[model samples]
Target: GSTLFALVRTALRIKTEGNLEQANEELRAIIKKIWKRTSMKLLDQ
Candidate 1:
């Protein structure tokens, strides 16, 4: 499985609420922010 599978699970619940559009938007921002921070720390550490 890819690393994205876990994240899909994190966002899929919102889609179940009939909010896939918003879910994707939120998911996009979170993932962008997550990677921006995590990648910095992940590489620094």
Candidate 2:
């Protein structure tokens, strides 16, 4: 939940900075990071 909040904060900053493309990439990166971490944990189990 804290990680998600951090992502939202980062996304808002990127959007406010006015680089839509970079913001999109940033969001994608965040999601990918979370997804990879979750997948790794599941694999470990």
lDDT of 1 by residue, 1-45 (tens): 767998898688766777767788999999999989988999998
Poorest stretch of ten by lDDT in candidate 2: 14-23
Q: Write the per-residue lDDT of candidate 2 for residues 1-45, one digit (tens) a residue.
A: 599999999999978878877788999999999999999999999
Q: Would you list the clashing residue pairs of candidate 1? A: none
**Maximum-TM-score candidate:** 2
* CA lDDT of each prediction against the hidden true structure: 0.86, 0.93
Error of 1 at 21 (Å): 0.8
Reference-based lDDT, residue 35, model 1: 88
| Stretches of model 1 off by over 4 angstroms after superposition | 1-18
Candidate 2 RMSD computed on C-alpha atoms after optimal superposition onto the true structure:
14.4
Cα lDDT for residue 33, candidate 1: 99
